[PDB]
Symmetry: D2
Subunit: 260 residues, 4 copies
């Protein structure tokens, strides 16, 4: 547990990030959440963190595709929390197309959010962590940080970048009480994946649940989705003392994707 | 936690394996321990598992360099425990020499224990796990399962083998409720490493603690040893529900060794 | 050999790229070269390709940190050559600083050139290669595409990105007669590295050649630099028929860096 | 080219090894071949190396699953050739079964040949290479040296072991003029694979060529087999000066297998 700890999760209004936020609050951390969505939904999430788990929670809206906005977000988060012990760099987007058709503006958007925001958020968080001699940076990469699939040039590039950046962060901070690791999930049935399921379903002329099975069968040997709650549990483990010497590495929760 | 669970740890009379056993018993598992040592020491360890943690504990002596003895060990362990939910394949040895000088009998001994015993123990455990639709196989590999160092041909080969075998085990059992993963530690200050520290100390004409620092500085960016307790905590995480879709992968606790 | 082939090498006015260009021309390819430098030097290089090797050579100035300029460069290159069989994405820059001090504009410049230019150049080249059913895309990544070092966040990220992008390119084009691979060199004594050598020399108060030895000793077990000519030979091999089923992979020429 | 060079290829009476031998002889090396088969066939192969390529060729029968026989084989090979510049450790076997059914004697046979023979052959060859300050050790691993498939526990373990051993060999010999690398092929249509094709064909009730397509489609994105001649060309490249700083690494010729 994490009582007393101060955590920030990017892209935590929904999906994996919301589950990360929830598991951290359940472990006793105060939490800054972030991301887009309907204002009434975001506020109900923020207030639920506080009323279920007895922590402080803050929502800071920032579009993390802008470098300065990300750096300012971290400073505001730290001010809200009174410190910053755990940063989860989670916000991300996807777009599928073959390379020769891949929109330039989608390349730029995915690099900006999925890769550069991790750099700017880390850069802003590190001096706070270095001053207190304790920190956790948890980057949400992907199985696509280690291997590739067709039609995902920007995302694969970005996620491979995140894995590299994680290593660098870990080595620069080696021995300082700060670790940096990349969680690399396989398929998790959030809206980011439901769109891909829907696309397969129209391509193949099949019901959505058949399409979900086809999506799994191609990549994920277990034939089951990874859950956001599992991922939250992994982030809680990374934040624990057992993981004090776990740094610069990848934690794959991928149902076997990368074993073959 | 693991209340009700039945665990076997090979090479658990001392070192990392003893800490694994201890963390599993603390989480509520009954435990079979194994390995060499003074009989009075081994019995005090066995009885301490029971009296501190309120579990059942058994010591089964088996030299796991013999295939049949390993397979018979698993059967006896399962009979003692009334089942087998978690197998930790930990027992291992080391010998350093350059390849052209590496004793053939040391090659054979390290392959037999560090690689083949993992295969024979898994083979014996799997049908039990397959019948109950739940299992954890946790192989203790090394950073030397992913990268190399000089003078460790047999050990590096073996540990790379263990990582491959882990993948295979995971894929054959994908979706059955059984996962298989390899913990890959960096330096942990057990007697296996203290011998290497002593060897450096004589080579360099320096005190043991200087030698320990030199051993770390060459490989492990954090400049701190991984602890057996950290490793036990990782094994407990691998046994948890959060790790239900973690299979076929490596969990590096290595102070940054593999990041560079 | 490559008689008849049409090759483009980015960042080929000096360094590794010039050697790539030279080895390709020696194998009989016509070559488009690119990059910055003194106009008289660039023209002597262009004319030397033609007069020593009896090929056609063209210099096209393009700043490949601009997406549209890269895409237009490829189109102009193809028009000059009358086709495009081999693309070597080589141009790159470096900047060293720890993350919290790393200039934002240097992050952006290194991502733009070292990662995004590979994407835009590939995207423009692919349809030409797809129409003729033969192509080679050769991306110059680095040992820093697979592992990290301190103070190189942007470059490591970018080069890891290039390795991911290489995979994607290879899978999208699998079986079409087009391969895509990443050459991953260790240290090569170009001006990009001589600046780092000079920096070590001032930090340590030592002569340049001592500093060059220290730079090698830390990373590169062979204690010798990789040469640009070796790299050119690797690119020629990748362009050969023996490499028709070599695709989506990395070719490390790194003196052992990534083995440990 | 390799005029003057002295090469040994294990398991070169047929398959990949025969093609390796042939490409080396074509490049001008004298060659020792090895392996099982009909005596009239083996002698026609030996004499053909000499009469087509104008080199000396020798057949030495040794069962390389025996350590001493392997070490004695190398000594006899060196005596026949008058030296030993290039060793290709190629001989291997396969057996498919799930782990719990995998015969113990097949585990032992595959570890002995596919892993331990590489160690014993390297150990015997190294002192010869160290004395002349030049050598090439080329280990034939597999895509199964980097990733896994079901029902191939022993082979995957062994091939992962070979990749580890390759690294160690390279680091111990770093800077001595000796390199060690692992070629990692995907599917190559030799008798080792034709048996697996036949097995699929009976499982699925389909013609052999359909079965060959299914075998490729599952693993190898290019949908085409790697050829033995391609592999021979890779071994010739590894033996060249361009590869003087290529050491401790893997060269994947796998049609994209490991990119996804
Ligand atoms: N779903 C999966 O299968 C899967 C697998 C591996 C990795 N991932 C990664 O997990 C992360 C979360 O994915 P998800 O599936 O939960 O997606 P999601 O689409 O469900 O959630 C994305 C979150 O990011 C926020 N966000 C989007 N653009 C933003 C911006 N510019 N600035 C700030 N916040 C922004 C969204 O509002 C939301 O909170 C992403 O990095 C994704 O790449 C997902
Ligand atoms: N110490 C480290 O730095 C380190 C790092 C990474 C991986 N490892 C691995 O962790 C495992 C445990 O190592 P350790 O450092 O605790 O070593 P250790 O020498 O302290 O303990 C080895 C244990 O194995 C037992 N054992 C030895 N031979 C056996 C045999 N033939 N049959 C049954 N049991 C036998 C010993 O009695 C003891 O219980 C080994 O697999 C080792 O490779 C260790
Ligand atoms: N030198 C090494 O040790 C080493 C090792 C591994 C990988 N690399 C990579 O090899 C590649 C070449 O490096 P190098 O050492 O030859 O460097 P270099 O500095 O000697 O040459 C860089 C080349 O890129 C050109 N270039 C720079 N900015 C450009 C721009 N915006 N547009 C177009 N061209 C531009 C330069 O004019 C020059 O031709 C880079 O991608 C580098 O990352 C180098
Ligand atoms: N065929 C493939 O798809 C493929 C792919 C990747 C790696 N490999 C590896 O390539 C190597 C050659 O495989 P192949 O497909 O050519 O197989 P093969 O069965 O066609 O040839 C095997 C060769 O090894 C010899 N051999 C077998 N047992 C031996 C022993 N005990 N001692 C000495 N020689 C012995 C055989 O006589 C023959 O010369 C093996 O290491 C295999 O693992 C093959
Ligand atoms: Na893979
Ligand atoms: Na490494």
């Amino acid at each position: 547990m994490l009582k007393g700890k101060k955590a920030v999760v990017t892209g935590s209004t929904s999906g994996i990030g919301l589950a990360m936020a929830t598991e951290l609050a359940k472990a006793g951390a105060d939490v800054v959440i972030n991301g887009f969505g309907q204002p009434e939904d975001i506020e109900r999430e923020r207030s639920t963190l506080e009323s279920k788990f007895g922590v402080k929670a803050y929502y800071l809206n920032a579009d993390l595709s802008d470098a300065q906005a990300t750096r300012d977000f971290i400073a505001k988060a730290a001010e809200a929390l009174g410190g910053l012990d755990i940063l989860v760099n989670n916000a991300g987007i996807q777009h599928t197309a073959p390379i020769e058709e891949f929109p330039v503006d989608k390349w730029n958007a995915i690099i900006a959010l999925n890769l550069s925001a991790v750099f700017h958020g880390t850069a802003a968080a590190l001096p706070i962590m270095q001053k207190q001699g304790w920190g956790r940076i948890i980057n949400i990469a992907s199985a696509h940080g280690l291997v590739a699939s067709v039609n995902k040039s920007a995302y694969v590039a970005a996620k491979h970048g995140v894995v590299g950046l994680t290593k660098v962060t870990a080595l620069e901070n080696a021995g300082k009480g700060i670790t940096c690791n990349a969680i690399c999930p396989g398929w998790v049935r959030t809206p980011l994946v439901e769109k891909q399921i829907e696309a397969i379903s129209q391509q193949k002329g099949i019901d959505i649940e058949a399409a979900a099975r086809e999506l799994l069968a191609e990549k994920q040997p277990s034939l089951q989705f990874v859950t956001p709650e599992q991922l939250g549990g992994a982030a809680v483990f990374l934040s624990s003392a057992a993981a004090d010497q776990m740094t610069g590495t990848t934690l794959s929760l991928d149902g076997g994707w990368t074993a073959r």
